[PDB]
Design a protein around this ligand. Structure first.
Ligand code: ZN
Lengths: 564, 190, 93, 192, 61, 424
């Protein structure tokens, strides 16, 4: 529709025509922080506009409240915005209080043109149809979804817009039915924003190994939650790695050689920086398969290394210093053993990068380091604002870690990733030991009232780490029905729970159609009925924060609602 | 044997001369900077040695008591090549190792760690005086005055049992004027 | 100052005032096309990335604006922001 | 009005600025020569003609700061000067090893231009860049040995340093001039 | 020593800086009120480099 | 036995690798990557201001290509699939299958602002307009190699039963003209070491490349590593092939002799007088994917007696007689090519007459330096014969001055007669 996958080039040419000059800064990029894919997309975008010498500004934004703040203080000189990683799922034209007759210029002719473009780079679905069809200013980059799927909804939208008698009543009732069946779909991410920008770079001819690595990184960040999308996009990344890889073979390792490979990248947590033992131990998938949160699962992991013939001391060596023969042989050892434990999906081919002699890093490890920097890198409303400012400031640590000139900062990210995952694991074993999960009929509920690490889980990404750890543990059990989950943690300073509504998912190795997050609109509907003072301004609208006293009324109304 | 030793030495010479990070040849620079202030040693980070060529680290960690002397020899050759004009003297350089390998606590070290590189920690409770150990003995036969010399590396040595062509039952003595010595100190770690 | 006062004598305070008046007299006279009080590190790059280190709102420059949002980042002509790097509001290079 | 560290020497950045005023050979990847069948460069520090008359991959010579500004984008490739190649650097190394007293006649800008082009034009070298960095390193090390030998003969009178680089000179300047000054002051103090 | 000032050379250089600045202004107005920015970038950073040399020279003396 | 193979200008084989170039020329280069069972094609350009690089996945496995300003043309030799891709993408892409008999192949393809051209191993020569409309089918001797520049098409034909020959045309929007049809071509073929055999299995004709000068003169670069240029092609009774650059000789010279080997010249374009080429090093004759910068070789008329240079040089210094011979000949042939260009086609930039004048200056200077050697041996007749060659009367005064300083009054007298004849 607005800009299809075939015509991102026209949008980029328009950006240069409108908003490039030696004279003035004219382009503003709003990027949702606490989103790796949006970060990588903005990095690629900023390198493009660096090479093309477009004077531009990047603002990292936490949520919709900060969006409407910052948008309200943009000068008329700013005639293009790029909204990266948010804004598709909401009527931005209404939300930002746009009037096209307040933005129109040079209409002459049956024609219109405007003093500010607002381009939207978002992978979230369902699209708000006022962005896609209603607005003449909001300009969404589409993966193909609108043309592939939304023909009936397009028809219904335009006819209901035109349809201002019994036939008339039946028609407007019908198209209201279509649009209210399209809305009240659960939320879901269908693409990587970074691969979307990579398709733009492919259309311009700007592809190179830096931009390909950023595409790989932003795409790899989807792998935990949105494995089906990652499996859609992985073959195209293989094609581009082969296309850009240089032609020399049996190449001698040299200080200048950046080599980006497809090779075995196991589903283990930070293998090349953890010990081998810790890389099994702190992996979400390994914990799910082995039930590692208890002593019997720990015994099973020891049993595994014993049957592999690996001494436990060797397994606990830091991977650089771990025995070279074991590292050369590790693929064979895994092949010969991991089917016996059901861990055969540990085997995977993923993207590994090495730059001269300073050692290999996979896209898996790199996105873990970047998330760690986002999470922990550095009157109640004021304290909340200061907290959100800390998270905005963490964005630039992840940003700077994307540059090879600052690999010490990436190493900080690696260390913080290990310690974060340790905190996740300890809180997780607390939940599963003490059985904090309550099996309500429609969804599973978990509420963290007290304990250590509670001051971490006020960050949305760290809460989602614990959620994903728990959900991997649930998915790999045939005992449990695949119910949606609510996970909450109190902030004892603000006196508000942070609450996350989480999808289930099928076990990791199996293949079906994706299952959608309907906590987003369910939370909206309860928020619309209730007197409770809940906030819903986070970009990932299935995450909210709610005052402590309001939680039990809220969850009671949630479980009495039929929306889940 | 000395063909393989020559190849090991050449591999280490290449590690010093080629290893580079962010446009700086850190080991060439460190070796030169050490030579100027007249400390004849080199501090090597084994992360860098692993990153350069893990086969070299495999040789070193398999048998450090044979490989460390060859690495020291390589450092001497590079030291001369970067501080003395080729065709217009230095002692044998000490190799110092930095490591981040997993520590073994002092009480766990046992028979499986013999001849391995080991990392540990503790408190030094005592420090002895500087004893003198030979790096190079000038030697001669007590009877026929056959003269030779023995180079020594301190990783586990003796005089020869009988003369290298009668000279009697135990024939060799040291010549201390042309022999060379180094400081050796004992520490007790608790 | 040509772009802790208790520690000076009063002669030194009024001396510093007169000397700043002199510097400004030079860069305000002939040779004015050169900001004589400017930097003495040679200009290596014409466009630079700059990260906003402290907030200052919307300001105009010669043909546009910067809104100095805290922890935003620009890619911008160095000559249009040098004054703010000197004044400590912008971080990079 | 001048900082203490700039009082009697140049900063390394100023040395780079000086070297950046040298002409350098480039392959353009833009065409500015207009056919008979729009903005011109209009410079005042350097010659305007070559930039106004570029054609893609017809090699031409422009001042190095412009060549770098173009090479910051894809619009240029900087041809290495002939001395900055493996065989030529090896010939200079053999000269340095063969003649202990003399410095080899590398151009005065050699270290500075090697630094600049290895960082901003790493992909333009015909030779593998790791070997060129290695041989530039060999040259600086050997020349530094010769510098140390030379400093054993500082005087109250004068000194001669035939083919020493601008950067090597500038690195040594706040030492050699100070020591020869103090030797002069000692010597002249003795005169009746 | 403080070397003698190049009076005539510096008069000509300051004239050229003034005229080149006015040129860059005029072309910028022509852009605001074929359209390749690269020569303007070279002109701008040229004047920055040249003004640096004059600034360093005068501040030194 | 001989075998027909697909050709494209300066394309390379796969060798041991999994990627190669389909073509490269003054506009850009095209590379293909064997992406498992399908091919990733990248089209890259040297003028990145005019043209933007693009890439696509190819399911047919194209092995022929031709790249010019207006678009890229592709072909699959064994199945007859061809595709044309205009670079603006305002005009559409289009695809076609051209008919092949059993065992027939497309041997070369080319394109032109109003035509697309396909030639096959059985000698069929199929023309389409730029939008794919079939316009003609000829039969000719099999077109083993083919290119165009603007409207000028230049093709090389070969068979066991016709021998090596060429054709030259200028098709145009109007006044469609043929200059020479299947005239014999004086290029040297290879011997119809293993890396060379690999290349000649990929390209049995040994034509490394084939192109036009910037001023539109046909050029070809054969297995002997000698550039040939067809001079005076616009008047077919006077046309002649000039071996303007023996690149083996110039490589031996610039390397300082030593029978230097394992350095090879891979040509892209002549420009005016200066062959753009990749200098490949090592056993393989052709470039790798990180395409090196196309180094420049000035053309050198092959007058360099190697034995004389070996005697004098035993870094190579050239005797002034040989240097002036080459200077005189090179300046003469280049001035002639410039004159024919400026008469028939006219200036394309705004300085070619100035270049021609400067070149005439070099020509007369070379003549004077040879005249001086003739006078040094007091050979009045040789010196006088050289005096007739000078173009500028103003430079002919220097012949008077030299003959005076050589104490040859006979030369002075005769040259003064030429001065008067030239004034009159
Ligand atoms: Zn004896």
């Amino acid at each position: 529709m607005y800009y299809g996958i075939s015509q991102f080039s026209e949008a980029y040419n328009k950006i240069l025509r409108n908003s490039s000059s030696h004279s003035s800064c004219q382009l503003v990029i709003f990027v949702s922080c606490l989103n790796i894919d949006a970060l990588c997309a903005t990095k690629m975008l900023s390198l493009l506009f660096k090479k093309q010498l477009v004077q531009s500004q990047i603002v990292p934004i936490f949520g919709y409240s900060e969006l409407r703040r910052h948008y309200s203080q943009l000068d008329d000189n700013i005639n293009s915005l790029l909204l990266v990683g948010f804004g598709g799922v909401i009527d931005l034209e209404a939300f930002l209080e746009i009037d096209p007759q307040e933005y129109v210029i040079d209409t002459d002719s049956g024609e219109q043109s405007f003093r500010r473009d607002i381009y939207v780079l978002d992978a979230h679905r369902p699209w708000n149809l006022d962005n896609i069809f209603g607005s003449q200013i909001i300009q969404c980059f589409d993966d193909g979804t609108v043309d592939d799927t939304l023909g009936e909804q397009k028809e219904a939208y335009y006819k209901l817009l035109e349809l201002d008698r019994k036939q008339r009543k039946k028609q407007i009732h019908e198209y209201e039915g279509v649009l209210e069946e399209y809305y009240s779909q659960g939320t879901t991410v269908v693409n990587s924003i970074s691969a979307q920008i990579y398709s733009l770079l492919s259309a311009i001819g700007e592809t190179n190994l830096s931009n390909l690595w950023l595409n790989i990184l932003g795409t790899t960040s989807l792998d935990i939650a949105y494995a089906q999308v990652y499996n859609r996009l992985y073959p195209l990344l293989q094609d581009e790695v082969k296309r850009l890889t240089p032609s020399s073979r049996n190449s001698v390792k040299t200080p200048d050689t950046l080599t980006l490979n497809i090779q075995p990248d196991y589903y283990l947590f930070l293998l090349r920086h953890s010990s081998l033992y810790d890389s099994f131990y702190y992996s979400n998938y390994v914990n799910a398969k082995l039930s590692l949160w208890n002593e019997n699962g720990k015994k099973r992991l020891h049993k595994m290394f014993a049957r592999m013939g690996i001494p436990l001391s060797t397994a606990q060596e830091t991977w650089l210093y771990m025995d070279h023969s074991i590292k050369r042989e590790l693929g064979i050892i895994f092949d010969k053993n991991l089917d016996r434990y059901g861990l055969q999906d540990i085997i995977r081919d993923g993207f590994v990068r090495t730059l001269g002699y300073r050692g290999s890093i996979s896209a898996s490890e790199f996105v873990e380091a970047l998330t760690a920097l986002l999470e922990v890198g550095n009157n109640s409303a004021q304290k909340l604002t200061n907290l959100r400012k800390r998270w905005v400031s963490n964005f630039w640590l992840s940003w700077d870690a994307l540059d090879d000139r600052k690999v010490e900062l990436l190493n900080r990210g690696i260390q913080l990733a290990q310690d974060l995952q340790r905190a996740i694991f300890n809180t997780g074993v607390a939940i599963l030991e003490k059985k904090l999960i309550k099996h309500l009929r429609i969804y599973r509920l978990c509420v963290l009232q007290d304990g250590p690490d509670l001051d971490l889980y006020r960050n949305p990404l760290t809460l989602l780490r614990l959620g994903n750890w728990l959900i991997e543990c649930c998915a790999e059990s045939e005992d449990k029905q695949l119910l949606p989950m609510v996970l909450a943690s109190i902030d004892e300073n603000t006196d508000t729970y942070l609450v996350a509504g989480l999808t289930p998912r099928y076990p990791r190795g199996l293949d079906k159609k994706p299952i959608l997050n309907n906590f987003s609109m369910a939370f909206q509907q309860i928020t619309a009925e209730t007197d409770a003072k809940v906030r819903i301004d986070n970009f990932e609208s299935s995450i909210i924060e709610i005052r402590r006293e309001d939680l039990s009324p809220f969850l009671e109304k949630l479980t009495l609602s039929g929306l889940l | 044997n000395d063909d393989d030793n020559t190849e090991i030495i050449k591999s280490f010479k290449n590690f010093i001369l080629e290893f580079r990070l962010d446009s700086q040849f850190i080991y060439r620079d460190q070796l030169r900077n050490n030579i100027l202030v007249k400390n004849y040693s080199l501090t090597v980070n084994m992360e860098h040695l692993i990153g350069y060529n893990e086969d070299i680290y495999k040789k070193l960690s398999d048998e450090p008591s044979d490989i460390i002397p060859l690495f020291e020899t390589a450092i001497t050759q590079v030291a001369k090549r970067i501080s003395i004009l080729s065709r217009a003297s230095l002692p044998t350089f000490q190799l110092i190792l930095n490591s981040n390998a997993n520590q073994i606590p002092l009480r766990d070290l046992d028979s499986e760690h013999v001849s391995k590189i080991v990392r540990l920690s503790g408190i030094i409770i005592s420090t002895s005086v500087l004893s003198s150990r030979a790096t190079y003995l000038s030697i001669m036969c007590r009877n026929c005055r056959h003269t030779t010399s023995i180079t020594i590396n301190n990783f586990n040595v003796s005089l020869p049992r009988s003369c290298l062509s009668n000279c009697g039952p135990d024939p060799y003595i040291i010549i201390h004027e042309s022999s060379k010595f180094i400081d050796q100190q004992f520490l007790k770690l608790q | 100052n040509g772009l802790d006062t208790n520690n000076l004598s009063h002669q030194e305070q009024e001396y510093l005032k007169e000397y700043c008046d002199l510097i400004t007299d030079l860069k305000s006279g002939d040779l004015v096309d050169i900001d004589l009080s400017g930097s003495l590190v040679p200009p290596s790059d014409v466009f630079i990335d700059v990260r906003v280190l402290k907030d200052a709102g919307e300001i105009q420059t010669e043909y546009g604006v910067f809104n100095l949002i805290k922890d935003s980042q620009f890619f911008v002509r160095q000559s249009d922001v040098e004054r703010l790097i000197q004044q400590g509001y912008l971080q990079k290079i | 009005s001048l900082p203490a560290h700039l009082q009697q020497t140049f900063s390394p950045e100023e040395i780079q600025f000086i070297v950046e005023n040298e002409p350098i050979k480039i392959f353009p990847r833009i065409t500015t020569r207009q056919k008979i069948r729009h903005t011109r460069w209009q410079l005042i520090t350097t010659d305007d003609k070559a930039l106004n008359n570029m054609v893609a991959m017809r090699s031409t010579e422009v001042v190095l700061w412009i060549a770098l500004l173009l090479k910051q984008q894809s619009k240029c490739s900087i041809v290495a000067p002939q001395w900055l190649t493996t065989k030529e650097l090896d010939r200079k190394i053999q000269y340095e090893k063969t003649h202990p007293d003399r410095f080899s006649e590398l151009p005065w800008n050699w270290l500075v231009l090697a630094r600049i082009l290895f960082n901003k034009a790493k992909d333009d070298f015909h030779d593998p860049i790791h070997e060129l960095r290695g041989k530039i390193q060999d040259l600086r090390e050997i020349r530094q040995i010769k510098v140390l030998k030379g400093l054993k003969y500082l005087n109250e009178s004068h000194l001669q340093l035939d083919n020493l680089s601008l950067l090597e000179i500038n690195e040594l300047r706040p030492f050699i001039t100070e020591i020869m000054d103090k030797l002069r002051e000692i010597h002249t103090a003795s005169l009746t | 020593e403080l070397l003698p000032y190049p009076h005539q050379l510096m008069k000509r250089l300051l004239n050229r800086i003034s005229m080149q600045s006015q040129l860059i202004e005029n072309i910028s107005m022509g852009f605001l009120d074929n359209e390749s920015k690269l020569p303007l970038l070279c002109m701008e950073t040229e004047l920055e480099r040249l003004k640096f040399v004059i600034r360093s020279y005068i501040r030194c003396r | 036995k001989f075998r027909y193979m697909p050709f494209s200008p300066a394309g390379t084989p796969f060798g041991f690798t999994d990627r190669r170039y389909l073509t490269m020329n003054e506009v850009g280069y095209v590379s293909t990557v064997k992406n498992s069972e399908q091919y990733s094609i990248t089209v890259s350009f040297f003028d990145v201001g005019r043209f933007r690089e693009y890439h696509f996945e190819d399911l047919f496995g194209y092995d022929l290509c031709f790249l010019n300003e207006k678009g890229t043309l592709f072909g699959q030799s064994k199945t007859g699939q061809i595709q044309y891709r205009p670079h603006d993408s305002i005009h559409s892409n289009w695809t076609k299958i051209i008919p092949l008999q059993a065992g027939e192949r497309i041997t070369s393809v080319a394109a032109t602002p109003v035509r697309v051209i396909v030639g096959t191993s059985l000698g069929y020569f199929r023309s389409f307009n730029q939008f794919g409309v079939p316009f003609a089918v000829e039969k000719t001797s099999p077109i083993v190699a083919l290119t165009a520049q603007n409207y000028r098409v230049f093709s090389v034909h070969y068979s066991q039963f016709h021998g090596l020959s060429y054709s030259l045309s200028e098709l145009g929007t109007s006044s469609k003209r043929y200059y020479k049809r299947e005239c014999p071509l004086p290029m040297s073929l290879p011997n119809i070491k293993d890396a060379n055999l690999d290349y000649y299995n990929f390209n049995p004709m040994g034509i490394k490349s084939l192109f036009f000068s910037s001023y539109g003169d046909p050029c070809i670069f054969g297995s002997d590593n000698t550039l040939l240029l067809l001079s005076k092609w616009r008047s077919p009774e006077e046309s002649k092939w000039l071996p303007i650059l023996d690149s083996n000789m110039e490589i031996w010279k610039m390397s300082g002799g030593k029978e230097t080997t394992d350095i090879h010249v891979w040509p892209l374009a002549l420009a005016y007088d200066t062959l753009n080429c990749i200098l490949v090093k090592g056993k393989h004759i052709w470039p790798e994917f990180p395409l090196p910068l196309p180094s420049e070789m000035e053309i050198r008329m092959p007058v360099f007696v190697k034995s004389k240079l070996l005697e004098e040089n035993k870094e190579i210094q050239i005797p002034v007689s040989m240097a002036a011979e080459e200077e005189y000949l090179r300046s003469k042939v280049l001035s002639e090519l410039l004159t024919d260009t400026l008469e028939n086609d006219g200036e394309m930039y705004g300085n070619e007459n100035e270049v021609l004048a400067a070149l005439n200056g070099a020509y007369d200077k070379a003549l004077l330096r040879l005249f001086a050697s003739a006078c040094s041996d007091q050979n009045v007749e040789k010196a006088l014969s050289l005096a007739h060659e000078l173009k500028q009367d103003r430079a002919l005064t220097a012949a008077v001055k030299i003959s005076e300083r050589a104490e040859l009054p006979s030369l002075v007298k005769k040259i003064n007669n030429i001065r008067e004849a030239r004034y009159e």
